[PDB]
Structure formats: structure tokens, C-alpha cells
């Protein structure tokens, strides 16, 4: 170390107070005041505005979020879509509950959970397949050939539903990328494209309704950031 | 010092190590910073400890190979499904169909998951797992008979009562999946171009026998609330002892697509 | 049992456990691959070590260099549609074609997976009279510059001498910013997931024909299963339709392998690579 | 004795050992008195035990990269300094400017210390250390805000309150030096041609993010005794975890000069 | 803290300890160079072992010898200014040029230091038909004599046979009176700090073209850090201005490397090496 | 590291190992999946432990 003999300036190591993220390092004097001898009212007196629980930013990501709520009739046959495709996590984190929370974070590394409900009165038949093609923006050459046909989707990571047996279905998609995380400020490198095909058509006129939920588990949030890019 | 040296063993020199071999050594130059510079193996890149490259993982993935129907006009003892017992099939409607001109279209039949994975080998063995899905309600009904005829065909004079069979009562039940063992006079059978419409007596070198899904009954259903048709959905899985040897063949050449 | 109301054989269950046998007994026979084959096959990680020929450089001149991308070798080559015109009757016949290319053992495995990690092995076969062959890798893009240098001063150099070792074997390491890289084409441009590398094979004296055989380096590893690729029947190599000026093979191919016969098929007139949007 | 000999292992012969490799062995002839004649390593030739050849020593040397000013006309929230977080820069005025003719002059922009040392590699990683000198007295005054925006730019709608920042009160204080960590989605970023006037969204492959030195205040100063301008002097140091890989590039060719 | 009145990051302090992180926490990530690169880089002492091509002898005749100084190879070659004249319009265009030379991995490191210590490794590539190559060192100056001998009887001799080993590899030891020697030009004449050595590469039969590649011997060591050298942009190799008779590349270079293409730049008219006094 | 190497023993090279010999070694390439891929000896194929080849 270059040695330094200082006697005219105090190594003012106090007047240095980090508050969560921001570090103030001050000269002259730091002052602080208010009403003295602070107490708090017991929890019976207030707390009619809160639940007996705390919510971090990791939940709010573990909450299921409705993506789709629609139907599909008997006119769609095998190997055709019954639901719109979902980009993971672009078509999930774009809902306001998640987007308002992920803001201020650099990136996200977590496994995503796509759950789908199915409505059936016991007179309806059919089967339906829910698969996920990994990294669709990195191998666009192969996307539509692995998702235009059942038996090329089901050898991928998939989840089936017998319409007259399963009323709920949930596929767990772990995070997978050439990278460590999912860039949030640029939304670069989605790690799967959920597609929904028809394994077998409906046998009656009555369509089937479905709800698509999506949440995350195993959540590792990145570094805090402003998150704004030029345009 | 510098003294002489005894003569060494007689050697024999090559232009290259053997391309064919998996192991032993390779004579290449390293373009890295140092010789034997290698990247460590990192597992569970895909999120799971299953070695997604292992043959014993790939072979155990179910895949749909053919659909049949089961209706209120089906007669008893009518065959619903009949296949040679063999791992390699064709994808039903997942053909590669490209346009050649304004009005010339050609179709390439595409390989099964098992067909592709065994495409580079010559012989196979082991048990197979055939899954049958019945897209129906609890208010359809029917008996099917899944009988494995190990050395023979299903023809006239073929009684299925000689053979390991399963008579499943499909009232509430909806699915069905059996491990069909490997029974053959040969420790291995031949990998081949798959053919649905062949008996066993032809392709006797590539299949163990024939399996048959046979109706024991018409499909019972009231027409005013449920349908008369129920689709049979067949999948093929490749057991646990499924072993594949002799890598001196190719049945399927793969290609990549161009971005459009 | 073998049947029931719950899904009797889902994917996640097939990976681990088989359903009950039709015999309701043990259905398994013991592994005897080592006893008949004399060898055991269990993992594609080992099988990709097998080196087969992949591409050939013919349509340039007498050059002293041949630069091309490395990740393109992990892909299977593009399949092309060939237009043939009858020199007599002037009607069109149509087939398939590999333009101076062919897949490898490596390419059969790599097309089932999404990402790769590890080094690629490249072995070259040249024509007669060539004395040396040299290999060097370079980054293809000096980032932030509209042009890349034509030389380098700290890059790897590797010299093989043909008339004493006829096959010039090189091993190209894994140099990419990310854990596991991508090897297929994409339109991503913000920042990159592939390690974009060139590889320059030289010949002294300069020559025309360069035959390349590719294989997996020891550290080769693929990551995410995605599925079986689009394939073409191998039997389609021998099927042909005859026209006036010669034979039209359904699967037309060049002398990519300097040790295979030249098939007696007439040259096409136009070539078009099958795009992903051409599938019906 | 003189008996026969068994055949040896098949060998494969080269014209040269691999140029590319750092280690293993070299086939050259020794022109010395004996083979493997080598000079022992003697350390501290430079007077210190620091291995002046070690990358981990060279990388930790501060170097001035750009100057800015901080005046009594500076508005609050006005950016004083804004850079992509990256090790390689250009020397400000230390260009090589040689005369070509009686009146043709050309200028070669010259590389940073870090730029030169990483010039032969392809990818880098690790934390960087940016130092800010303020040539002033104890009788100037000012707040600056050094906020590290790891993935983004500094544009409109960019609040710096989301980011690790340091609000330093420059009354008596005169210098400032922070270790800016390596936060990126990639374990390594690209070495490149440096560009000051680019945002992060371009060069997204070579930089981690943008760092910004922003005024929180005008410069306070009485004009009758001290000046109104104070020069910001920025230096760049390369942390301790600064790791650099993939030696297959060249951005800068060095040359020697001729004695005049 | 991060700021204060004392110098917050002097040189002597930067060599040992880093300032506090902006996070006021641990800013360091673990080294994973071996996990992605597959190799670890820590010291330039090892990197200089990499051999790249350095010079070429073309402009002599069919000779049986080529004598030149050894320490000149540790220097980076001189950069020259090239005068081009348009054969049509007769106006001058001006660029840069390496006259039958180029720097090495070794030269990137050696130009940061003042003195050297250890042996230099020289590998030669010749043209066809050459059978042998011989290497010998000699002192360049019989001290006190106006002339040096043309032969020697106790010098080192080292013979490599090309058609069985195509690259003639030699290692030239460190023979100098002092602990660590100097390798750059100076006007010192009283007594000397460099070990002045010649190196004579012979060819049987005599040939014209000699291509030399240089690298660091095992015992290579540099001593005193002095600073970054004068550099030229590598991208300037591909930039060119077109004139009538051809292309004028900003960084013009010869076929120094017997495995690189010959760039399509017209010959210059005059060459002038940049002197230290030319810098402005 | 990369130091020099001492000179080896003088060798003598052949086009082929000796055809005539039963034992020692063979220089061929293996067209199998791996080198020295061999099928184990199974005795009593003929129904008896007598080595019908002896």
C-alpha cells in the first residue's frame, strides 16, 4: 500500500450511512431529529387493514395468474391448436401483477409452472396435449416441426389430459438457457414455448372450456436495475 | 554422457487413428491454449439429472403411432388393431410434404422416435410397452382383448386363447398399457424399414411376432347423450431391457431446415 | 394393474418404471450385448466420437485457404430441391439433393438437442502433391468493426504434413461466452449465444479439393432434448427415374466423401433449400 | 543374445509439435552445450517480488481514460460522465500521429492498458474499479452520484434510485474510487473495439451495463479566490476477479520504432 | 470508505487491494475459466510459448544461407509508411506496411518489458525440394577485429530433414555476459548489454524462400515493465482505398506466413520506417 | 512447461505385422464401435465340452 500520513483531515468513516441500496458519504455534519421517545400502538388498535401474513416479491411470482380463459369446439381436429401458444415467460410476466414486481430487477432464473383447468360434464370425450418447446428464439428452424404434430410434441416434455378424467393439469418447466438467467430489461432468450394441440377431437357438439394459469417457483431474482433501454 | 542406444520395438505408422472407434485415443492437434484442454461435464443442464443423452432414457419415451376407432357397429371378435411387435414405426400424419412446383407435391414418411434412435444400428432386442388410450366417458362400455402371439400371425384358425392376453372391462376404465416381452428364436431381431400392412410371416427377421387388440364386444352407448365412435390411440414405449447393437446401418438421413 | 382410470403410462412415469407385463411375471431378459456384439452401447455421448465425412470444398479455385463457420458442422446439412430438365422433351423432373454435403454420426445426435458444449474435431483429406495443411480459428467478427482482419498474430496454429500423415487431424476447442452454446441459425442480434468462430484450412502448395470429416471431441455434450429432426429415407439414394441425358436420383449427392463412387446422376438446373415455411 | 522383438504400438508422426499449445513438450534441437539447457528463473529482477509478468498484476494498474469538467454552470441531474462498463478503452490524447507528406497527417487511436492486455483474448469477466479525481480545493463544493445500472442504459425515464449508488459530499473530500461488480446474464462478455459514444443497447455483447457520474448540484465557489471549473479525472483499474479467456483474437498489432 | 481526502486508489495500493464495492458487499464472482474455457490463463510467461510466424526471407537469390540477428526477433517489427502513386492520375495515396514481417504472440508480451532472459525458439518452413536445414549461432563480432570469420569449428550444429519433418525446429540458448540482456536498438558502444548473436539457416539444395516462426523457449523471462507499445488497429488490415492499378490497404503486408493468402494490394513506391522522432 | 525431450531409441518400421505368426499383436484397424472389441469364447456350443477345434 502507498502509505499516507494524514493529520489535517479526519477519516470520517461515520457520516457514511447506507440505506438498503443508496450509500451517502458525507463531510461536515449529519443531523437527524423528530418527536422523541417513539412508541407504537399495539396490533389490536390497528391491523384491521392487513392479513396475518407478509408478501415478499418472490411470492407475487409464486401466485398463479390467469393467462387464457376460452373454449374449443368439435370442429378442431387432431394436431391442431386448441389454445394460443404461450412464450415463457414473456406472455406471463407481461401481466401487471408480475410486471410491476419484476421491475427494478435485472433478470429472473426460476422454473415456470403452467397449469390448465378443464370443464367437462361426464358425457364429453376427447384428449388434449400440452407441451413445451425449449428456447424457441434460439432454434427457430425447428419450432414449427416439433409442434405441428402430436407424437413430435409428446416426445418432448409434455402433459396430457383425458377430458373425462382430468379436471386440472400442470406442467413444470424448469429454467433452461445457454445463460444463467432471463434478461428482464431486454426480454431476451425465452426458455420455452408452450403449445396446445388436440390429441383427439370432441365427440359431441358441446365445446370444452379451459383456464390457463402460470406462476414461477425456484425463484432467483437478479440485481436491482433501472431497466430502461434506448430507442 | 551420450552413449549409444539399443534398437526399439518395430512400429507401424498410420495417417490417422481409426475413425470408427469410440475410445482409445485421437491424434489431433489441440488448437486450445494447452493440449488435452477439455470442458468439464456438467449434468442437469436440462433441469434434471436424467442424462438426456443416454440411450436408456431416450428409448423410454411414449409416442403415438396409429389411431383406430371403436364404434357401435363393431362386431365381436373384430380386430381393432394388429401390429408386428417391433420398435420402429412411421409417424401417422407427420409427413414432410414439400411443394416441388406449382402443382407437384411429394411426401416423405417420417420416422418413429424409436425408428430414428435405432436407425443407425442393425439389430435390436428387449421388451416393448404398448399403450392404448380410449377417448370415452364412464358411460361407454366395452371389452377388448390384447393378446401377444409371439411367433405367429393372426389369421384364420388363430385362437387367441393360447396366448397371454388381457380382457379389460372398459366401463369406467379409460387407458391401458402393457409391457410386451421379447420372445424370439434369435437373441436379436433386425432393424428395418417399417411396414404396417405386412404380416409377421413376412418381416420374420425384423419382428418377434404379432400383437392384436381385438374387440370382444360392440361398443355400448345411448345415442342421445354420448357418441357412437371412440378413438383408439396407440403409443409405443421401449421397455427397460431394450438393447441395440451393431452400428453399421442407416435407414434415415436427417437434415436441417432453412429459415424463411 | 395394466388398466384403470388414471393415466396408465404418462411421460414422467415411462422414464422410470414400466407397466406390468402381459404375462404378469418378469418380462426382462438379461443384457447380452457384450456376448454377441462384443461391445456395449448405452450412451450417444460416446457414439458421437465416430468421425464421418461432412462437407467438401470444390467450387472454388486453386486457393491456399478455406474459411467457414464451425457451428454449421454440428447442424445437419441443408436438404435441397433439385430441378431437372429433360434435354430432349423439356419437361421437368424433381428430386432431392445434398449440395456437396452429408450428415455425420455427430449430426444424427446433435439434431435431437438444442444446445451444445465442447470441442469439435475436424479431419481433412486433400489431393495429391499437397505437402502441408494448417488450421487456425478466428472470431469471424471483430465486434464493433465493420470488417475483420485478414491476419492474426496470437491465434492457434497447427501444421500437419500430408505425405507422412495423410489425414490432417485438428481439434477446435469450445470458445464461447456462455455455459452451453447454440449451433443453429437464428435472427438474434442484440447479444449472442453462439460462439461465432471461423476455421482456416491452408494447403501448401495451394489446391482445389478439400474433403472434411467431422466428429465429436472428448468434451462434447448436448443439453436439451427437443425431438427427432426432419429425415429422408436412406433407400431413396438408389431410387432413380431415367430421362434422356441420364439418371435422376431421388436423393442426389456429390463426391463429398473422397472414397465414395461418383453416382451417375445428371447435374440439376436449380437448387432450393427446404425452408421451415415449406412444410405442409 | 539378439532375439527378435514384439511389434510396438502403432504411432503417428508429425512435422512439428502443435504451435498453439502452451505446455506438454517441444521437439526443437538444442543449440546449447547440452540438451534441456535452461536458465533458472530469478525473481524480483525488477526490485519487487511481484511477478511483473503475471496477468493478475498487470490488470490492477490504474490508467486515465477520460477527463470531464464540473463548473458553476452545471445544472443539477446533469450527467458529467457516462460509460459502458467494460475494461477496454482508448487513450484520450495519446494517439500515434505521424506525418505522411508535407501536409498529410494521420492519427492512430491507441489502446488502453486493459485494452492491450486483453487484445489477444476474446472474452472477459470480473469486477472493474473506476477512480474519479476532482482537482479542487477544500473551498469548492458538490454532490455527485455514481450509480451502476447493470443491464440498462441511462435515458429518459431512467431513475437512478433503483441502483446501487454513492452520493459523495465533495467539500473537503477530493477523490473517489469504487469496485463496480460484474453483473451480466453471460459468464463472460466480449472484448471489442472500444466506443465511447455508444449506448449499452448497442455493444450489448461487450459491456455489462452503463455507469453514470451525475451531478446532484451545481459547483459552489466564490469567484474571487477560486475558479469555477474543476476537472474530473477518470481512471480504470481491473478488480481482482478479472478473468480473461479464449485467446483467439487480435484487436491491436504492436510495432517498434526506429531510432532517429 | 469509497471517498475521502487521501488518495483513494494510488498505484502501490491498486496492486494489492481493491476499493470498497458500490454494493458495500462482496463484489467478487468465483473463477470459472476452467469450467467454460476448459483452460486457465494467469501468466504471460506461459502464453509466450505459443509460436507464430515472424519474418520471411524472399528478396535474396537462390542462396544456401541466411544470417540475421536473434534479438531483433524479440522486438516487434518496424512499421513502415508506404507511398503509393496512381499509375493513371499520378496523385499520392499513403498507408502503412509490414515489410515481410509481422509480430508474434511473443512480441505482444516482449514489447511491454525492458530486458529479457532466456532462449528463443525458431522454427523454419521452406519450399519444396529442400532436403535439409541446418542451424548455427555465431557471435556476429570477433571483438577487436574489423572482420568476423566466415566459418567456425566449435559452434553448434543442428540438422533437420524436411521431407520427413516438414518444420525445422531449433532452440537458440541465452548466451550473453549479463544476468538479463537487452533486445532493442541503442547507441551504446563502450561495452555491451546485449548478447549479439547471429543465426545461420542453411538449405540443401539452396533455396530462395525461408519462412520463420518464432516463439518463447522454456526459460523465457522478461524483467522490467515499461508500458504498452505503439500499436496499430487490426481492423485496418481489411480497410482499403481503391485506385486505378488496384487496391491500397491501410495496413499492407507481405506473404510472411507461408499459409496466408496474398492480399490483393499493389506494391508501394517508397518505404519509410516510423522513427521515434516522427511521433506528434 | 514445454521443455525439450531426450532422443528415443532407434526404431524400425514395417508395412504389416508378420503374417506367419500365430501370436504377439496385429496392427489392423477395428471397424467395431471400440478398439479390441472381441466376442467372448463360449464353449460347448456343439453340446459337449470337448474343444472340437483342438
Residue numbers in the entry:
A (entry chain B): 1 to 231
B (entry chain C), D (entry chain C): 1 to 260
C (entry chain A), E (entry chain A): 1 to 280
F (entry chain C): 1 to 54
Publication passage describing the model:
Black queen cell virus (BQCV) is the etiological agent of a fatal disease of honeybee queen larvae and pupae. Viruses from the family Dicistroviridae have nonenveloped icosahedral capsids that protect linear single-stranded positive-sense RNA genomes 8,500 to 10,200 nucleotides in length. The major capsid proteins VP1 to VP3 of dicistroviruses have a jelly roll β-sandwich fold common to capsid proteins of many other viruses and form the capsid shell with pseudo-T= 3 icosahedral symmetry.
The virion has pseudo-T=3 icosahedral symmetry with 60 copies of each of the viral structural proteins VP1, VP2, and VP3. VP1 subunits form pentamers around the 5-fold axes, whereas VP2 and VP3 subunits constitute alternating heterohexamers around the icosahedral 3-fold axes. A complete model of the major capsid proteins of BQCV could be built except for seven C-terminal residues of VP3. The finger-like protrusions of BQCV reach 34 Å above the virion surface. Each of the protrusions is formed by the C terminus of VP1 and CD loops of VP1 and VP3. However, no density corresponding to VP4 could be identified in the virion structure. SDS gel electrophoresis and mass spectrometry analysis showed that VP4 subunits are present in both native and crystallized BQCV virions.
